Design an enzyme around this catalytic site. Structure first.
Site, PDB file in Angstrom:
ATOM      1  N   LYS A 244       0.782  -1.140   0.000  1.00 52.48           N
ATOM      2  CA  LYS A 244       0.000   0.000   0.000  1.00 52.48           C
ATOM      3  C   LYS A 244       0.887   1.293   0.000  1.00 52.48           C
ATOM      4  O   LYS A 244       2.026   1.320   0.517  1.00 52.48           O
ATOM      5  CB  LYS A 244      -1.042  -0.111   1.114  1.00 52.48           C
ATOM      6  CG  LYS A 244      -2.194  -1.073   0.751  1.00 52.48           C
ATOM      7  CD  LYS A 244      -3.567  -0.545   1.066  1.00 52.48           C
ATOM      8  CE  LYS A 244      -4.664  -1.548   0.685  1.00 52.48           C
ATOM      9  NZ  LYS A 244      -5.076  -2.491   1.815  1.00 52.48           N
TER      10      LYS A 244
ATOM     11  N   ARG B 185      -4.739  -9.658   4.431  1.00 52.25           N
ATOM     12  CA  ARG B 185      -5.061  -9.785   3.007  1.00 52.25           C
ATOM     13  C   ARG B 185      -3.911  -9.249   2.182  1.00 52.25           C
ATOM     14  O   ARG B 185      -3.790  -8.048   1.996  1.00 52.25           O
ATOM     15  CB  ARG B 185      -6.372  -9.050   2.676  1.00 52.25           C
ATOM     16  CG  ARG B 185      -6.641  -8.838   1.184  1.00 52.25           C
ATOM     17  CD  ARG B 185      -7.921  -8.008   0.894  1.00 52.25           C
ATOM     18  NE  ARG B 185      -8.078  -7.725  -0.541  1.00 52.25           N
ATOM     19  CZ  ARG B 185      -7.432  -6.754  -1.195  1.00 52.25           C
ATOM     20  NH1 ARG B 185      -6.594  -5.942  -0.535  1.00 52.25           N
ATOM     21  NH2 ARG B 185      -7.621  -6.600  -2.510  1.00 52.25           N
TER      22      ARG B 185
HETATM   23  N1  LIG Z   1     -11.450  -5.554   2.821  1.00 57.40           N
HETATM   24  C1  LIG Z   1     -10.566  -4.904   2.033  1.00 57.40           C
HETATM   25  N2  LIG Z   1     -10.824  -4.816   0.681  1.00 57.40           N
HETATM   26  C2  LIG Z   1      -9.935  -4.181  -0.125  1.00 57.40           C
HETATM   27  C3  LIG Z   1      -8.715  -3.559   0.507  1.00 57.40           C
HETATM   28  C4  LIG Z   1      -8.527  -3.699   1.981  1.00 57.40           C
HETATM   29  O1  LIG Z   1      -7.538  -3.234   2.581  1.00 57.40           O
HETATM   30  N3  LIG Z   1      -9.465  -4.379   2.653  1.00 57.40           N
HETATM   31  N4  LIG Z   1      -7.827  -2.898  -0.276  1.00 57.40           N
HETATM   32  C5  LIG Z   1      -8.017  -2.788  -1.612  1.00 57.40           C
HETATM   33  C6  LIG Z   1      -6.973  -2.048  -2.357  1.00 57.40           C
HETATM   34  C7  LIG Z   1      -7.680  -1.044  -3.239  1.00 57.40           C
HETATM   35  N5  LIG Z   1      -7.574   0.324  -2.760  1.00 57.40           N
HETATM   36  C8  LIG Z   1      -6.379   0.832  -2.420  1.00 57.40           C
HETATM   37  C9  LIG Z   1      -5.208   0.497  -3.109  1.00 57.40           C
HETATM   38  C10 LIG Z   1      -3.996   1.065  -2.735  1.00 57.40           C
HETATM   39  C11 LIG Z   1      -3.972   1.952  -1.660  1.00 57.40           C
HETATM   40  C12 LIG Z   1      -2.689   2.570  -1.200  1.00 57.40           C
HETATM   41  O2  LIG Z   1      -1.647   2.226  -1.800  1.00 57.40           O
HETATM   42  O3  LIG Z   1      -2.698   3.369  -0.217  1.00 57.40           O
HETATM   43  C13 LIG Z   1      -5.150   2.277  -1.000  1.00 57.40           C
HETATM   44  C14 LIG Z   1      -6.358   1.719  -1.371  1.00 57.40           C
HETATM   45  C15 LIG Z   1      -9.199  -3.362  -2.345  1.00 57.40           C
HETATM   46  N6  LIG Z   1     -10.135  -4.065  -1.449  1.00 57.40           N
END
Ligand SMILES: Nc1nc2c(c(=O)[nH]1)N=C(CCNc1ccc(C(=O)O)cc1)CN2
Ligand SMILES: Nc1nc2c(c(=O)[nH]1)N=C(CCNc1ccc(C(=O)O)cc1)CN2
Lengths: 264, 264
Positions: B210, B244
């Site tokens: 992230k 995850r």
């Molecule tokens: N329950 C759950 N579902 C998810 C998650 C997550 O952390 N928990 N992240 C996901 C990644 C998609 N969104 C991001 C992708 C990258 C970042 C970042 O790099 O900060 C922040 C948000 C998609 N689905």
């Protein structure tokens, strides 16, 4: 939190700012020689310089005769100390050895018998006025209480230290993983590092590639990076100051991440 | 500690025994198609099977139309569910979508708007009687108190859940890293995960690769393994249940090491 620095010769290490990485110089021995062969050293200098480049802030240089260890290691301290602009720690329990190293250009003394092996060591720490690391270690493995015993045993090291005349500022603690402990002892000790802190001194935790990782995860030495990860991470949120690792690139990035989480 | 299992169709996950790894299926899109192209899926099945082999215990399958997402993902759930002997979670906030997935063979519902986006979702969780994951997320980023607010906001998810009729056993919590949080917000949240536990439900923590890792360490996505390490390690001693991640091989070995230290 710490209000004092690790004044150590030309250098000084700051305990509050970040986890301090100690890099293991792996002392591959040019067997055809006992002493400073060109390969022997170059290879060592090649590998410190590397670690300089990996984020590591101190270099560690590990039945056998004294004389050898002295011809082994006194021309090696001397290259790196003169080639690599960082503090350099000696890995001996011997006082005759301790001298020579620091005489060469060694900085911080790392002992695996915590002044117990050869009390005279502590005097030498006194004398050249340099940090010493004391490690928990013993010659049986009967504990009523792991921790309570560790902490005891550690304390009878500090006694000798402090008696010979080592300032409290120059004292560091090591729980001594994989020494005198079954791999369940090792786990419990990792579980309860934090009680090393009541004792009021920096803790250095040494776990890179250690055999308990392989007891848990069941993977041998060159596949033990991840293990080393966790030990260093948990190591750190439990408030330890140095970690002594082989894999400088990788652990160095694990330090800094925890360092930002716990807000260190 | 937990006295209940994650009964979920043909499978069941045990919370006490070990940290439960959720593997991110990366949904590389055969653009020339919207639906189940051979490459599209094979490639997906190739990659789940892999993760089956890496220690991962659940597979996660992530402005765009519903219809698509349904033609996108309903033939994909269906291969893996039929090819890979593990529980499979859907990554949608849509109720019309939620149905189709679980209809395909989907197992656990993963929502990034925590029943807020489309309340109807929760009803569907009720109906097919399946675990749902609720995530903290919002559409501004003004917090009086990060945590207190998170925990608030989480709570108004559980409300909808529980009102629509989801048993407490089937509820999971996600702090929702990188959502609606500056990268200092993200850090603080990691620092204070443990207060997610007062709320009495499993926590799943999602941090693989992230962007806050890259804010701290200053290294981009394909060099973020170590970051992911620490977040998962600290993640875990703070008592979270699932992580995850993308890097199943590597994190899976970090789980198990912490799992042995904290004695889980
Ligand atoms: N329950 C759950 N579902 C998810 C998650 C997550 O952390 N928990 N992240 C996901 C990644 C998609 N969104 C991001 C992708 C990258 C970042 C970042 O790099 O900060 C922040 C948000 C998609 N689905
Ligand atoms: N201060 C300090 N000095 C050290 C250490 C250590 O952990 N701390 N380990 C060292 C590794 C050498 N001994 C062992 C090597 C491997 C293992 C094991 O795999 O369990 C246990 C012990 C050498 N010197």
């Amino acid at each position: 939190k710490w209000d004092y620095d690790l004044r150590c010769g030309e250098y000084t290490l700051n305990l509050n700012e970040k986890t301090l990485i100690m890099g293991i110089l792996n002392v591959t021995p040019d067997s055809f020689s006992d002493g400073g062969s060109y390969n022997e050293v170059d290879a060592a200098v090649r590998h410190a310089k590397e670690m300089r480049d990996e984020g590591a802030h101190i270099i560690d240089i590990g039945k056998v005769s004294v004389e050898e260890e002295i011809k082994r290691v006194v021309p090696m301290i001397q290259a790196v100390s003169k080639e690599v602009k960082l503090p350099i720690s000696i890995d001996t329990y011997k006082a005759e050895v301790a001298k020579q190293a620091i005489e060469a250009g060694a900085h911080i003394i790392n002992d695996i018998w915590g002044a117990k092996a050869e009390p005279k060591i502590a005097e030498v720490a006194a004398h050249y006025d340099v940090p010493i690391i004391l490690m928990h270690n013993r010659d049986n493995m009967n504990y009523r209480n792991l921790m309570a015993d560790m902490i005891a045993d550690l304390y009878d090291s500090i006694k000798i230290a402090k008696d010979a005349g080592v300032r409290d500022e120059n004292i560091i603690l090591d729980p001594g993983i994989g020494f005198a402990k079954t791999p369940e002892q090792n786990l419990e000790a990792m579980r309860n590092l934090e009680q090393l802190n009541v004792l009021g001194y920096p803790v250095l935790l040494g776990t890179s590639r250690k055999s308990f990782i392989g007891h848990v995860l069941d993977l041998p030495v060159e596949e033990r990076l991840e293990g080393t990860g966790a030990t260093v991470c948990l190591g750190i949120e439990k408030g330890c100051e140095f970690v002594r690792v082989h894999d400088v690139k990788e652990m160095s990035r694990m330090a800094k991440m925890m360092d930002a989480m716990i807000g260190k």
